[PDB]
Symmetry: C3
Subunit: 627 residues, 3 copies
């Protein structure tokens, strides 16, 4: 006879007064029940959220069901036996609009991602009709979004849609991506057309019809960059130009998240097919009780024979009114030979600016990175992942300069905070555009005083203490402008050609051990005034030819009391305490004057206290006394 | 009897034909008057924007008022005595949607911020019922927003709402945040229910009713980062789970502007309570002339005894039609035991990308910064603040590298332009992600020529001239690849272990004064071919043991004419002009040949012009002649 | 008599049943035809997109046309001879909403830009009534936008609008920016008012009227920055305060893309005039068949004599119903003395985050930049431009530090990838906030091993090999902390005052050729233990005064067998193989002991194998043997 409700209160406690609402592929059904019951004092908290459905009799003894979730409950003034309620049914999938989070999914295909969302909320009542092997996303992010909003966006990108199968006590999100996911309802594989201007016909019929068509873009071209293939023409274009005029206007868009071109192809195909799904649609209305969204059904008895086609019900509106039945539906078909595809209804979240984030890596490591300088990151909004190498995509790091091998490298280390930023705000395409200090990652130089101290500083990777650092700090405090270069072990330097140094005043070089200097040709050292050398022991001058000492006033050789002296006045003192000249052959003396011996005119040696080892070692050790 | 208008034209000049519109908590009232007057030639500029109100008689001789601001004026075809006008009333607070600016508010609580907005526009007609001590925001920004849009967002974040008190000639924005701000209207503390199916009842009654309920999220969890507490679990969760099924679906969101966790708690509480305010609401309609938005009123005579409750009028629609009255209202209550809280209706402005901004600080300073390297900033859009240390929050600066103390520091100085950027686009959370040159902050190296000159440069902080700089510029112009390091005073260098230098050709080191070199063990200098030393005065070799000179061909000591010479052929010349050998004890000569004296075979001294002081000082001074 | 369709099927094949729709300045007309034809089997692909129009008879034998583009086609149930169709007409300009791209326009005025968009799509049917000489935008970007959406935004910024001229077979987008672009339709230069309460009047008349007015902001002030004029008060304010109260509330907004202040003036003027266009508008309805959007027409016979004015039809709705006529229009005028100006209806695209982009320049160059360090860029989404110096605005580059001349420079070179970012997301205001490596622009140091290697590296500009680089790499691998400085030619160094070096152990300095050292005063070298010098040839000590050698244990001069020795024990050996002392005057010996000769107590020379040239040259050459 008529419709009866299937509900936890017992089908007899509630009986439908009317029905409203509708359905659409990839969009939540929405059914405004209106019903009456003998109790005005029904606790709506018992109804609300709970599963409720309808039994609608079909001819041939079939039944149709409209199971769903009570998202709104309401009651309205009516006679006491017939207290009126206006429950809205929604799918369990609608409850995913009642929850939000931020969560990262990695190395998962979107069918696997969605089923994680469903299964974590206990929503088991889903089913798979998908036919493509979908891409395994390296990294997906739910961000500032509901679980339904995220879910819908992912399907819309891949061009998945969903439609529902309704049982007595279950309603099932069937995931669908092809004609083959659709089915023809028994006995409604054809629906006749018979107008309301006929006498009221015995079966179910489409009573009204309105074909509609629209100009829709004939092609889409998509590009994305790939830093691993920056030369590669990732550009891919999909085309379904229509026969009609203006059927060829092309669209173009930039970053389809795809990176492999053969994935982007289908992102284009779906984005066009969704608009091609608008190029033709067919309104109908009628009594097709058996038919539902995503069902198929041939048309019969239509006058325009182009319309005697198999149709895909993209959307339905339903009406029932009932006595204690009149059934009506209003619906939009498309030609089943054109694949449906959902629009980008589900507006993506975009991060309208940068993020901060801890850098992370394996528990014992200090840096975790790859051949492009990417890093793993823990976002401060991520609740779910353990702040380790699994907590992000490999994220590229910007560098102050970067070229073909060459350029500046400043690899951010584990625990360092970074300024992330997304390739369009797209949470799925992070990139790092800065590093930043914080009360943990403290500043090198205490800044309210040392604000003038610029320059880099390091800290040895593995277990580096604050004292194990290279540095090139640079203070330009007026009256204290200091360069300070530090190597915590060694400072190699190479120059292919010429060094220079130019120092207005002083230099102190301390070599706490040993210096080698190897000169390939020449040295030339020049002093305006004074040199000193001091040596606590020995000096050797392996001069392979000539050593010429060109003194101007006094050479004074010394060793203790033994003293050779050359005055520029030509007086020589060779005087000592014992002497033993020797020659294997001749020896001589000559004078233009008169050599004589023991004259007593030379009274003594020219000892001046120089060369006394005690002082000389002391003067050579003088820099190296203990602190 | 009926309603009369209160207006500057005189209450008798305008008389109401009808009324429309409604009210809602935290949202502007909106009242479509329709009225008639004997003048069709009313200058609407006189009406428009001006304060106008209604007097509505209440039983017991009371009056109700609907004072407001004429936001729209209109006239429409009618009989001459009854020229018809369709004035819309809006609040004075609505005029804040007619003004926009950008302005920064700092160290102010949102109640103080709003009253600044009101008081600056002269809108004195506001009032305070707030009960919480609100957080003192360190920094708030009106940006790309109206004064109403900004105002509403701030209240919605704190979970403030407002409702109006209407006088004859004033209407007052009452700020409200608790049940206690509401009041019970005299004589309408209860309203009976009596249906239209009763005979027309003598008092004021609710004639219709529709309870409604919705599934709403049972909890919200909020996180924000804090660079001053980056380890701290700022995470805070608020929960109000419902008894019904699906009453526990949790929400999560990231950055609530809060930083202190106990502030974020109430941001969650309000965001849930606003949705809990949707979990139950009660439509009514009836003649409750006395009741208005934010009033309280018990219900009586309802059948379902759960409904005999105190109710909070969250919203009202009003109708009057009049003769020269029929009053109707349609309204939504909530149960007064549940706190109202406004939704996030007021979409926040987000800066969809970075900003430029001058750096600023105290008038005599050059850098103004804190222990984390934050700075004050003058935004180019800020009109109101004097480009000093008060013109911003302490803004963190990104650095090319940053770690635990260690890392690169590049503190931006006063007058320098920076690339700002916001933690989500949120103007209240700026951060700096770059520095940039401009025609004032000119580039170091004139770039159309010197594009190859890389590297840092400095300029002494206090009063540094362009010549007072450290530098490490780095040109890789092919055929001119130059390192250039400069210290405007001193270049300290340390190496914990080993230096190296490796120079393919030349080195020039000039020490314009004095060099000390202190070697803790050994030196070893080696020359393939030639050394020279020149000294304008003195050299000292304090060799504490042995000095051995190992010559291979000719030692030639000299001082003027005095010359000692050692040839490797074993010939020695010790010849001078005067000589005086001396010994305290013996002396000797020996020959295997035959010593004899004045042979005349040695004809002369070996003078070669070496050691003549005039040349030697000159050759040592030769580098140091005047330019 | 009535209306007949002008269509490719022949005006007799289709005849109008009714008409709907309307028009608005700067907005696309939209006309829901309803028509009937003897064929239900009309291929809609023939109708769709094609040009179709109406002929409407005007009195005095005139005709009105409504040519347009069939954007939607539809058919609906009707009698066979009268199969009903519901074609929607849209402008050809509407097809620009059916195409999208990203394209950059440079050094073009917006009138030139738009005509490029039109002319590239073949849409010739546009016309120019513009009166201002518009600014020549340096750089405009279509991004994530349709060609209509982009087009509309550009006109709305300049405050251009458009209206249509309709022919039989053409409809023309007239670009308009002043009253003078409007025209008065013959015979409708005045339209009488005569109410429906009159007997049906013989001519065309406005049958109804509703004046409306609104509070609208009295002024707008605009600012933008200019890095070429960062001191300049680019601030410009436009004002049109109304006489009424609240007629002076000012708006302020930041970045009007203008840079020259006199351009920004008109951006304000238009943004206010558009809102001033809302301050007054006049609804009408009536039979003004001749009048259309953007037409002018005086009013006559109105009672309120303020309304007997010239009016500008800002918008129209049309209705026809027809027999085989009743014409109706509903319209909004403004007073023609107030310039119309379109609202910011067309929401701008904003880049909600950064972009990557290749750097580019002239084909033979390596760097292309200007006196501010700007660069040209090829965006990865740009399809149209050849990746050269024409492919972008001069884009500023952020630098890690930047000041008055001084600061760090890191000029990104041709082929380098950069992180772009926009001044608000505004695609017309790009800026670069980072550089990034990629599989082409490879990282300097192979990072999975060398992650510890920090520091800059270069690569000679013109044809630099990987070996032609300056470097300052900095490894802090624990137990290997290395500084490494490299100049591919020369390393100049200056210090204004003092150097220091402090090396815990070793130093090796190799000078592969020649070292000069020039000391302006003093040197002081001190060795705890040992020095060596080795020289393959010669050493010279031009000591202009005294050389004093202060030995402590043994001076041992040598040249082959010739040996002078000074022991600190006072024993001297002066012994050789031949000797020839000589003096121009006296010579002496003296002893306190007893000189005697050939005693045989000195048995031999003190030869020790030192000074043998073969060894000595070898020991000086020892560092320089072949590898």
């Amino acid at each position: 006879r008529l419709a009866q409700v299937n509900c936890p209160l017992g089908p007899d406690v509630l009986l439908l007064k009317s029905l409203g609402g509708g359905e659409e592929l990839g969009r939540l059904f929405d059914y405004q029940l209106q019903l009456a019951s003998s109790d005005a004092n029904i606790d709506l908290n018992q109804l609300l959220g709970k599963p409720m459905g309808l039994s609608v009799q079909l001819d041939g003894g079939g039944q149709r069901y409209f199971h769903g979730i009570v998202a709104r409950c309401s009651q309205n003034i009516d006679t006491g036996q017939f207290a009126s309620y206006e429950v809205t049914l929604r799918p369990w999938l609608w409850l995913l609009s009642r929850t939000s989070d931020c969560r990262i999914f990695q190395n998962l295909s979107i069918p696997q991602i969605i089923k994680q969302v469903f299964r974590d909320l206990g929503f088991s009542d889903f089913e798979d009709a998908l036919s493509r092997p979908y891409r395994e996303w390296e990294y997906c992010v739910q961000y500032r979004e509901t679980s339904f909003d995220f879910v819908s966006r992912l399907m819309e990108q891949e061009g998945i849609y969903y439609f529902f199968r309704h049982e007595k006590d279950r309603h099932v999100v069937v995931l669908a991506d092809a004609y083959g996911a659709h089915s023809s309802v028994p006995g409604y594989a054809s629906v006749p057309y018979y107008p309301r201007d006929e006498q009221q016909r015995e079966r179910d019929h489409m009573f009204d019809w309105h074909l509609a068509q629209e100009v829709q873009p004939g092609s889409l071209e998509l590009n994305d960059y790939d830093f691993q293939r920056p030369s590669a023409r990732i550009d891919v274009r999909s085309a379904m130009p229509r026969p009609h005029s203006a059927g060829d206007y092309p669209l173009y868009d930039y970053p389809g998240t795809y990176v492999q071109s053969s994935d982007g192809e289908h992102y284009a195909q779906t984005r066009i097919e969704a608009l091609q799904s608008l190029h033709e649609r067919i309104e109908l209305s009628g009594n097709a009780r058996g038919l539902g969204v995503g069902n198929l059904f041939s048309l019969t008895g239509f006058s325009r024979q182009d319309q005697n086609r198999e149709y895909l019900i993209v959307s339905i509106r339903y009406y029932l009114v009932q006595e204690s039945a009149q059934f009506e539906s209003h619906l939009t078909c498309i030609d089943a030979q054109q694949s449906f595809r959902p629009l980008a209804t589900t507006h993506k979240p975009m991060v309208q600016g940068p993020q901060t984030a801890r850098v992370v890596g394996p528990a014992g490591e200090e840096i975790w990175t790859d051949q492009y300088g990417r890093v793993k990151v823990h976002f401060h909004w991520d609740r779910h992942d353990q702040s380790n190498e699994n907590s992000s995509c490999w994220i590229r790091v910007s560098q102050a300069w970067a070229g073909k091998n060459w350029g500046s490298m400043q690899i951010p280390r584990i625990g360092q905070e970074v300024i992330v930023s997304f390739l369009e705000g797209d949470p799925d395409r992070p990139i790092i555009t800065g590093r930043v200090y914080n009360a943990e990652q403290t500043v090198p130089y205490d800044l309210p005083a040392n604000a003038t101290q610029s320059g880099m500083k390091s800290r040895s990777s593995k277990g580096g203490s604050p004292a194990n650092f290279n540095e090139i700090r640079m203070e330009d405090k007026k009256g204290a402008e200091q360069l300070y270069i530090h190597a915590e072990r060694n400072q190699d330097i190479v120059v292919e050609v010429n060094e220079s140094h130019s120092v207005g005043n002083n230099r102190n070089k301390s070599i706490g051990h040993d210096e080698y200097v190897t000169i390939g040709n020449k040295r030339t050292r020049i002093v305006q005034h004074v040199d000193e050398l001091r040596v606590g022991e020995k000096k050797l001058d392996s001069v392979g030819q000539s050593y010429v000492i060109e003194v101007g006033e006094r050479l004074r050789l010394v060793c203790g009391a033994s003293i050779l002296e050359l005055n520029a006045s030509g007086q020589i003192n060779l005087c000592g305490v014992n002497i033993s000249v020797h020659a294997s052959a001749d020896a001589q003396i000559n004078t233009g004057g008169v050599l004589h011996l023991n004259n007593g005119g030379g009274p003594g040696t020219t000892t001046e206290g120089q060369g006394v080892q005690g002082a000389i070692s002391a003067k050579a050790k003088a820099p190296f006394s203990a602190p």
